[model samples]
Target chain A: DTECHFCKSVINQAWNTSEQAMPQAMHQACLRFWLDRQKCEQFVEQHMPQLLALVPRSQDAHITCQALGVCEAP
Target chain B: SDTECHFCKSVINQAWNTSEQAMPQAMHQACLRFWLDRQKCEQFVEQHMPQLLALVPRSQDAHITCQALGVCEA
Candidate 1:
């Protein structure tokens, strides 16, 4: 299984949607957490436009997590 | 000038500094401006500082990008 680039954990349900030259596999939650912490929306907008467009400009990391299919709402 | 700043793709004259690892390949004011505009100071300190330090000696004051750019206040 591909490992999450940020968390260094095995990513079972990988979100391979980064905008880097090399594709970075990540857990959806891990990626969201990192993006939130880093405030790297500009980087994401430049590199991962498709993924950026999917995430609303709101406090809903869970919405992105669910959209990536790594989590489900109850 | 014979050398061009890698970042701005412009000729380098008096106000420019060359990389330790890549000699004759320099960076000028425009390049530094572009870099500062795009990357945050914290990001540079956290990520690029170590790599830059390793490449050039601290005694050389090589981390002073602003000085090279001729914008150093102090």
Candidate 2:
């Protein structure tokens, strides 16, 4: 539906408007945590924007997660 | 006390001094290097780290940013 799909809300309003000023996507599991109000998550809430910012900076999703320190040590 | 790097899950005693106000947790020099160079978004800061700091909270340390920018020579 050109009217829209839910995948567009993943990166919040930031990438919803790209540097080119128009674009978007909504990853599966990410969209689950990134969108639905019932999906409020610790990881997503704490680092959603940073994840989006890091996505373009890192080559892989795990790399971005690593940079975000998801599984860091004690 | 020795600390852990949030990115690599390694010891931070050597990479960076976590006592700085800019870092929310310990980080590695190499980790940030790869991150900063990913897309060269630092193209904005007098170097580029400002953009990184803008994206991440409590990550605006000039000491680390300048070092990452190559202004604070190794």
Candidate 3:
């Protein structure tokens, strides 16, 4: 194993140092990260509607086949 | 010729020798004169530049220290 995780420390301290003295509400790094995550979630939700429509045709058939085999012949 | 001054947009000619006189300036006709003599619009950009600059956080080696003491970036 490595002596120390240099990359981890760098990543953690990079934003923290850049954001020194600024209040949490006005911190540029925090605001940028928050806005970035919000945009990403909105983007995922936009595409999810189309992804959900394909799910029934794919997974539903396998589940139906399994159900038919397990059910009593009628 | 003595035909009534046909131009509705005429700058009131004072030569008409009648007691009944239309006012010199009509509401619509005076619009051009008003625009020509209008006051300058107010500008806050240059006047408040110093104050706005003070609000911006400093950026340099000792920038965080400067921001703590409320120093201007400029």
Candidate 4:
């Protein structure tokens, strides 16, 4: 079953919009909360390669960070 | 005492606390809101989403942002 990787809940909403290959699917709220979390930087640090795979490499590392609603653009 | 927002390069009245110790980094509360809204191109997402039936919009982020907020269906 597709479950929120963070909150561990099954999502039954309209659109998950995420790529099917994504290892994790989380609630939009969960993503918001996760970004709000203080530890999310290191969390992304560990999984950045996994995330980098999903984006066009035409940009840079920190560019994608803001796409997840973190820091700045490249 | 205050740090510069690495994103907008303004004085961070309220810090998001990206780092400290050896290197200090942070973001303003406004920068976070700006970063959150800008990267996703919510303007486009907001424009198109309302045309779709069986879905309602949200003020927090509008349509894709609404979907991103996860408050659509059961």
Candidate 5:
């Protein structure tokens, strides 16, 4: 079994929202729900690709770092 | 030789080995407070607060300032 499907479900749900043209947008709450469904720490390192892909290239680092709550810039 | 505006007690500087060579050198209470505030914006009380608090020194000379920093954390 997949240890965690947090990002997987998030990506799926987010994709659905995007396809439906739901303008509500993906809030942090959405990510929290997805993360709650996953194994601790496993989801972060496992699905980095999909997770990072969702972030716009320009502001990717900022968003990811902020999500991790690490303020130091690379 | 007593006009210095040190951030915390002298013991703090000694216990943590907070010289320039430390992994993360200590900052003045004001400066550190600012960084903590920035951290809070990401996770707030739920996700960020506990994590950020974990990084701070709990029983130290700067307890009052640290408590104020906790308020600033989220």
Candidate 6:
């Protein structure tokens, strides 16, 4: 069972690829959500190619860094 | 005759400031340099400035300054 790095939950069915040298697996929706929050689409795409490929296909893609405890609470 | 820096345990004879009124201690130039090197950015200082300033008895009296140090040895 592959787990989502951000939410720390199991990737049920639909997922995305991190495609890093180590290759981290994530939920498709989760990756989109995270990428959006980063607010650096071009940078992420250039730096993280694997995630870029999954962005266009993700559904319900609303990501938050709150799960990762990096974003400040609003 | 009896003033010491809060961070470096040295006499703050010149080029020193204090966060007194709250902490009531002196700080030397080298101490600030040490802190800034570790912090690596002005943003860290800005973010925590309020908290540090609040420690002063009279916040209006609080002041911080920086200067270049070191010698050009070839």
Instruction: Please provide, for model 6 over A15-73, each residue's C-alpha lDDT reduced to its tens digit, 9 standing for 90 to 100.
Output: 22211211222222123334243332332333344323322233321232233332343
Best-matching candidate per TM-score: 2
Candidate 6 segments exceeding 4 Å error: A1-74, B1-32, B35-41, B58-74
Instruction: Give the fraction of reference interface contacts each candidate recovers.
Output: 0.00, 0.00, 0.00, 0.00, 0.00, 0.00
lDDT of 2 by residue, B1-74 (tens): 11101211111111122222222211222223434342332221224233323443233343353344232344
Q: What is the TM-score of each candidate against the true structure?
A: 0.15, 0.20, 0.18, 0.17, 0.17, 0.18
RMSD (Cα, Å) for all candidates, in order, is 22.2, 20.0, 37.8, 19.6, 22.7, 25.1
Residue range B1-74, candidate 3, lDDT tens digits: 11111110010111110101111112112222333322210122223224322322223323333233233133
Q: Across residues B1-74, which tens digit of lDDT does each residue of candidate 6 receive?
A: 01101111111101011212212111122124344242332333344334433422232211211111111111
Steric clash pairs (candidate 4): none
Docking class of 5: incorrect
lDDT of 2 by residue, A1-74 (tens): 11011111111222222211211121222333323333323323343353344224222323333343332323
Better of 3 and 4 by DockQ: 4
Please give the DockQ score of every candidate, comma-separated: 0.02, 0.02, 0.01, 0.03, 0.02, 0.01
TM-score result, candidate 6: 0.18
- Stretches of candidate 5 exceeding 4 Å from the true structure: A1-74, B1-10, B13-45, B58-74
lDDT of 4 by residue, A1-74 (tens): 11011111101111122122222322121243333433333333454354334322323323333333333423
Error of 3 at B69 (Å): 53
| Model 6: lDDT to the true structure | 0.24
* Total clashing pairs in model 6: 2
Q: Give fnat (model 4).
A: 0.00
Candidate 4 RMSD to the correct structure:
19.6
Weakest ten-residue segment in model 6 chain B by summed lDDT: B1-10
